[PDB]
Amino acid sequence: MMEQVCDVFDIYAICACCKVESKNEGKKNEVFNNYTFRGLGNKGVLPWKCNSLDMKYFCAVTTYVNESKYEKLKYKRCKYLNKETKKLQNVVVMGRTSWESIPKKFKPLSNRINVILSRTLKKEDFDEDVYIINKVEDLIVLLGKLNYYKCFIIGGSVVYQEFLEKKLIKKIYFTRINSTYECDVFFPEINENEYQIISVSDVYTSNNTTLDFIIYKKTNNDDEEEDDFVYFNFNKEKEEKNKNSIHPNDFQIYNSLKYKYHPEYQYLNIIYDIMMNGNKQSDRTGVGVLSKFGYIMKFDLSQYFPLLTTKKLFLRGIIEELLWFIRGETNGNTLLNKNVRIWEANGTREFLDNRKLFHREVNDLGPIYGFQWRHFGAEYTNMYDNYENKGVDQLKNIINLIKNDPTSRRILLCAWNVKDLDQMALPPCHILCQFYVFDGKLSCIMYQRSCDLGLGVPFNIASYSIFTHMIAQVCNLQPAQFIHVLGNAHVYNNHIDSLKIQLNRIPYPFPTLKLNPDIKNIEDFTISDFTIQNYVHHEKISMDMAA
Amino acid sequence: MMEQVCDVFDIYAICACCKVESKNEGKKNEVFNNYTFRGLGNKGVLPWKCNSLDMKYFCAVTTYVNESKYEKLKYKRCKYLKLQNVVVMGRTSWESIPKKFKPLSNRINVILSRTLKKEDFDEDVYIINKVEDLIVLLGKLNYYKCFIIGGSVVYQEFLEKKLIKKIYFTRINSTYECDVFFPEINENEYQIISVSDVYTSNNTTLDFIIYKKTNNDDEEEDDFVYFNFNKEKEEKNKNSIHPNDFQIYNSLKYKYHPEYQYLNIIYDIMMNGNKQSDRTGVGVLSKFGYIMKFDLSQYFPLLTTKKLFLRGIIEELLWFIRGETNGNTLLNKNVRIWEANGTREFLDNRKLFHREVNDLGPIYGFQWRHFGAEYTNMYDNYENKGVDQLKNIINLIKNDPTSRRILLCAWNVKDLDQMALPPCHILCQFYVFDGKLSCIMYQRSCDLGLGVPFNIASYSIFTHMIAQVCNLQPAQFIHVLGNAHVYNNHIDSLKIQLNRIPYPFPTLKLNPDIKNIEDFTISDFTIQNYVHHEKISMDMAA
Numbered sequence A: 001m002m003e004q005v006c007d008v009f010d011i012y013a014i015c016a017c018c019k020v021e022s023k024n025e026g027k028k029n030e031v032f033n034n035y036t037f038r039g040l041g042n043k044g045v046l047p048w049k050c051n052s053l054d055m056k057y058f059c060a061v062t063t064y065v066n067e068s069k070y071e072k073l074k075y076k077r078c079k080y081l082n083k084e085t086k087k088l089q090n091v092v093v094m095g096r097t098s099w100e101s102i103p104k105k106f107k108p109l110s111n112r113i114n115v116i117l118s119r120t121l122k123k124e125d126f127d128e129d130v131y132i133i134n135k136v137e138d139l140i141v142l143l144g145k146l147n148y149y150k151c152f153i154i155g156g157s158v159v160y161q162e163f164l165e166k167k168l169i170k171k172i173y174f175t176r177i178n179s180t181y182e183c184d185v186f187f188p189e190i191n192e193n194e195y196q197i198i199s200v201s202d203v204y205t206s207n208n209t210t211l212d213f214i215i216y217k218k219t220n221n222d223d224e225e226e227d228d229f230v231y232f233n234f235n236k237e238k239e240e241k242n243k244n245s246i247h248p249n250d251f252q253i254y255n256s257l258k259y260k261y262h263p264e265y266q267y268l269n270i271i272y273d274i275m276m277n278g279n280k281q282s283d284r285t286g287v288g289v290l291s292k293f294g295y296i297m298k299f300d301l302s303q304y305f306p307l308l309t310t311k312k313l314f315l316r317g318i319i320e321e322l323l324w325f326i327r328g329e330t331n332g333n334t335l336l337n338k339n340v341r342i343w344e345a346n347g348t349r350e351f352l353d354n355r356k357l358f359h360r361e362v363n364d365l366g367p368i369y370g371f372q373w374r375h376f377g378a379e380y381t382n383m384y385d386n387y388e389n390k391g392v393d394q395l396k397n398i399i400n401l402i403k404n405d406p407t408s409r410r411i412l413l414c415a416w417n418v419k420d421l422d423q424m425a426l427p428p429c430h431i432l433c434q435f436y437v438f439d440g441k442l443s444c445i446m447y448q449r450s451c452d453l454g455l456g457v458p459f460n461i462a463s464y465s466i467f468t469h470m471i472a473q474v475c476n477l478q479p480a481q482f483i484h485v486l487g488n489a490h491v492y493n494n495h496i497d498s499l500k501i502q503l504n505r506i507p508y509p510f511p512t513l514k515l516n517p518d519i520k521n522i523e524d525f526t527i528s529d530f531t532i533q534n535y536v537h538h539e540k541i542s543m544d545m546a547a
Numbered sequence B: 001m002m003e004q005v006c007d008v009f010d011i012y013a014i015c016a017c018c019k020v021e022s023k024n025e026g027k028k029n030e031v032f033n034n035y036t037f038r039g040l041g042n043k044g045v046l047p048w049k050c051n052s053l054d055m056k057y058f059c060a061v062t063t064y065v066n067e068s069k070y071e072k073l074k075y076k077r078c079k080y081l082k083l084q085n086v087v088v089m090g091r092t093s094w095e096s097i098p099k100k101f102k103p104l105s106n107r108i109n110v111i112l113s114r115t116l117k118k119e120d121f122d123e124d125v126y127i128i129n130k131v132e133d134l135i136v137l138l139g140k141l142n143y144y145k146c147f148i149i150g151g152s153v154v155y156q157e158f159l160e161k162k163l164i165k166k167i168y169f170t171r172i173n174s175t176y177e178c179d180v181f182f183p184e185i186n187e188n189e190y191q192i193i194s195v196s197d198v199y200t201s202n203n204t205t206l207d208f209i210i211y212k213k214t215n216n217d218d219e220e221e222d223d224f225v226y227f228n229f230n231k232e233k234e235e236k237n238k239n240s241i242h243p244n245d246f247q248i249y250n251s252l253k254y255k256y257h258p259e260y261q262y263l264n265i266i267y268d269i270m271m272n273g274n275k276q277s278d279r280t281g282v283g284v285l286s287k288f289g290y291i292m293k294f295d296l297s298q299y300f301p302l303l304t305t306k307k308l309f310l311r312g313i314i315e316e317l318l319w320f321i322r323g324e325t326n327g328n329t330l331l332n333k334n335v336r337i338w339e340a341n342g343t344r345e346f347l348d349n350r351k352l353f354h355r356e357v358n359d360l361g362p363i364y365g366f367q368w369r370h371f372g373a374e375y376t377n378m379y380d381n382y383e384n385k386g387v388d389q390l391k392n393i394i395n396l397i398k399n400d401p402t403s404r405r406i407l408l409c410a411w412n413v414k415d416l417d418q419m420a421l422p423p424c425h426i427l428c429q430f431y432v433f434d435g436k437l438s439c440i441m442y443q444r445s446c447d448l449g450l451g452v453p454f455n456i457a458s459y460s461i462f463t464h465m466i467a468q469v470c471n472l473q474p475a476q477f478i479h480v481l482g483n484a485h486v487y488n489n490h491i492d493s494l495k496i497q498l499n500r501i502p503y504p505f506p507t508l509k510l511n512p513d514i515k516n517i518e519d520f521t522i523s524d525f526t527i528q529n530y531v532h533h534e535k536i537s538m539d540m541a542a
């Protein structure tokens, strides 16, 4: 074996990059990739001033050491050097400009061996406890003489550039600041053939922006208490049901990831699980699907808006649909006039007639969502009727319970009115919403009886996450979690190839949802009160590639 | 410094025990414990004759060998004094094994005897005159692990002289005639460190537990720590719960027994639960959103870490099925589940001033058979009024199994205020695949310490009932919990419960002649082989 320097001395890079203030040539159909995050600094400082969470992360990684693993590293570096026979710290290497950008109260970086690269400055020019080198070679020499855990290259685009040039980086701990700021210095474009992403963290919010942490890796070219584990798995099948028909070589990127902590994976793993272990059925005479029963996804709305990034989604339609529900409408023309066709196919003469709704006007969807939310129990007549003070206004009652009886375990909004099912153009897929209120925070569980993983679910997650924010706001609470429970979860055969593609796309940090803060009544929201910010995403996918 | 054989030479013991029958009384013991499973053999053979699953387990365990981890053993043993394992047995034992199966393939067969002729058998088939002579044969051979597939006698001595490291004990949860038994393991010398998932095979459930000798690449490893950089160092309520208490629960390495799905939630709530105070002045710890799954095809999920009675909840189920809302019907059968909710005072506080005592209103039963009808009183004849959901879901399961609309819903928004109390079990959704039925039940409010245990049982039974009247085999019962809480008053009790090791689940037997959901009677239900720890009053108040 030919030992590479970066491996022997464990030299890593850690940075944080934001999106660059682009010169929008008039194409807000922007293309996104990993290079989207390349902003390092502006006028000597960080483009975003400060970010306490990234700072905390940076400190955590560069100060962490495991003394028990040291002896193994010592033997390795010493053997490599042919050299063989008070707290262990990591080393941090930075350019002079980065060193000078650090406030005096933070210099030198605590509990770490600070190394500074410079030509214009020498040891005499510094008062602090630091090592001044004037070339990369001098670092390798220093490392072969120091007792240290790991070496992190912390900065200066110039510094990053040459260390990557000389191929001295074993891994890149890369922070993705999901927002745009003015920049004048950038991180070098990472050659995808030289570095692959192996892990993606959870997504967070800090200082009014979402962010996540990813790791790039340099590419190709008691134990018996563990044996008991082997035994317990004795009665297993050796391969997953649909392996032969699905083929894993297709999920290359998906399976090459070590840590998949990005929330979008809750959705991706379910798809993968259904594809690999799903039961073959013909949901609706002829179509055909793979299905499973019972899954739960959780999303932290205080930390991000879970709009899928592995593909492109628009939300104007589902938002208008939601406002439409809240208004208690069941008139399909209202949506059609707003160019939203979600319910178009379910309101045609033929569809209604086949539901035996012979006396139902076209686009009159019947006692669905809207009607149940505001008038559950009333006798439905037609979509133009005024159902004032008729039936139960669940929506209003849940808002009142949340305001005056927050700990109640009866705060539910139900659309599944057994008595009206047959009068509905379609029985509802979203059976109910239940709320939980703790320490001024609102969580929501939504139970879905039927789930089209490929086409529907992505939008459903968005709709209810938004709804949770809306209810939270009119009740003076902060949104916490949106919990999605899936009953019959299926993947349509026609969607398989498109989903295979999606699964091999690495998520981007989620976007954020902003509601007009002035709205205080659930009924006063209008389309312009909603804004999805920093939505970074992969190319849109036609789940059904038919032509 | 190695010098105490058992750990040194890696000697293990593997067995399979069943329950014993007593001529005085043949079943449903008053008190159970680990010694309940001691049956070893009967008249030269196994009490149960055969169990294919256990056969597979015994084989897999005794033949499994990992060579990469061998020299770590060759190193210290030599340093102490086609890799296969050693299977030490006795004469009676070796003589019970069939012809074609002797010697045990891929294994180094050894035998404890005082009259067997070494000269008669093969060389790869050693023999020994005494226990201590075994150590010797080991110091000469090249094996992986030494398994004592024993024999009553063989087991005993090996245990007394303390030569056993681990005891891969299989629990066959069924009673058979026995003449030979396994030695009562000393709880202070050995402890259970693992409990597998439960299974059904050859008409009995069973599980595998590992008894242990109380001694009393890294590249992506640091990455795991970095990604945990922002997580709370200590657990929220750890300070008020105290882990020294859950010492057995935390000592377990592998907890694959399904009961742990319930136990783990109790633990999660106690350790990370949010403190809240009902408008009653009572306090709870609560979490939001959990899911448990039980494979009814392999076992009936009746908690074993405490005692559970089912007559009441079965009658309640039959009561729902009849569509009744008459609280008196249950009281006259001494089922008082709904008594408190039917009193004059409770009804009045619900503002049901015009409701008769014990007239629970349009609850479960009324919704299952007449959803939509106008409720009058518990004595009215609602025949043909409202939607008969029960009848409908059953016809859907039979004629349109792949339907994703087979739901039974009790949360009638229009009738809630008329109900003595809103239902906790909102709905049941069914799923059918390959002639098998699964059911999801969503519970909006869950009393983990007292309610959930019965809740899991009720709906598991309901699943079997629906499955049978539709000629389907039960598959999974999936329990979705919404507001899941633990009353503060139960904490000490649940701590105790958390430190009990689950026994193998029992099975549920329904009278197979019943083919209509409405024809079941209390005598058509039988719980078999229910082994459990003693009863625990969740509220140790009195």
Ligand SMILES: NC(=O)C1=CN([C@@H]2O[C@H](COP(=O)(O)OP(=O)(O)OC[C@H]3O[C@@H](n4cnc5c(N)ncnc54)[C@H](OP(=O)(O)O)[C@@H]3O)[C@@H](O)[C@H]2O)C=CC1
Residues within 6 Å of the ligand: A014, A015, A016, A017, A039, A040, A041, A042, A043, A044, A045, A046, A094, A095, A096, A097, A098, A099, A101, A117, A118, A119, A120, A121, A133, A134, A135, A136, A154, A155, A156, A157, A158, A159, A160, A162, A185
């Ligand atoms: N987002 C992030 O993660 C990070 C952002 N930053 C930002 O980046 C900007 C600073 O980066 P940038 O301008 O690229 O400069 P650097 O901080 O990389 O420093 C460049 C200087 O370091 C010295 N140097 C670099 N390589 C060598 C070498 N091989 N031998 C000797 N000296 C060497 C020289 O010092 P001299 O001039 O004395 O000869 C040189 O001009 C700032 O705005 C800072 O806020 C910095 C680190 C991380």
Ligand SMILES: NC(=O)C1=CN([C@@H]2O[C@H](COP(=O)(O)OP(=O)(O)OC[C@H]3O[C@@H](n4cnc5c(N)ncnc54)[C@H](OP(=O)(O)O)[C@@H]3O)[C@@H](O)[C@H]2O)C=CC1
Residues within 6 Å of the ligand: B014, B015, B016, B017, B039, B040, B041, B042, B043, B044, B045, B046, B089, B090, B091, B092, B093, B094, B096, B112, B113, B114, B115, B116, B128, B129, B130, B131, B149, B150, B151, B152, B153, B154, B155, B157, B180
């Ligand atoms: N369920 C389970 O997991 C198991 C069940 N069994 C069942 O147990 C029954 C057999 O058990 P049991 O009757 O106790 O007999 P064993 O199978 O243990 O055989 C005992 C024989 O081993 C020999 N022996 C005893 N002590 C010594 C010693 N100190 N040194 C050398 N040899 C010794 C004797 O042979 P000799 O007469 O030549 O002196 C003796 O009669 C069977 O029905 C079998 O099916 C057996 C193993 C496991």
Ligand SMILES: O=c1ccn([C@H]2C[C@H](O)[C@@H](COP(=O)(O)O)O2)c(=O)[nH]1
Residues within 6 Å of the ligand: A427, A429, A450, A451, A452, A453, A455, A456, A457, A460, B404, B405
């Ligand atoms: O908001 C929605 C509406 C519908 N569907 C899907 C689920 C099913 O694939 C199909 C409805 O068919 P049934 O389950 O009702 O039969 O539409 C969704 O995923 N989300």
Ligand SMILES: O=c1ccn([C@H]2C[C@H](O)[C@@H](COP(=O)(O)O)O2)c(=O)[nH]1
Residues within 6 Å of the ligand: A409, A410, B421, B422, B424, B445, B446, B447, B448, B450, B451, B452, B455
């Ligand atoms: O079958 C049942 C019925 C009730 N409960 C519990 C949940 C709550 O602790 C209490 C009902 O009070 P509310 O949730 O409605 O407030 O009873 C159960 O766990 N299981």
Ligand SMILES: CCc1nc(N)nc(N)c1-c1ccc(Cl)cc1
Residues within 6 Å of the ligand: A014, A015, A016, A051, A054, A055, A057, A058, A094, A098, A099, A101, A102, A153, A154, A155, A175
């Ligand atoms: C929050 C700072 C930070 N976060 C990350 N993820 N990487 C870094 N390299 C730095 C950093 C920036 C400037 C200096 Cl001067 C030193 C280190």
Ligand SMILES: CCc1nc(N)nc(N)c1-c1ccc(Cl)cc1
Residues within 6 Å of the ligand: B014, B015, B016, B054, B055, B057, B058, B089, B093, B094, B096, B097, B148, B149, B150, B170
């Ligand atoms: C299926 C048999 C089996 N299963 C388990 N779990 N343990 C055992 N000790 C045996 C066994 C019983 C009798 C003989 Cl003779 C050999 C081995």
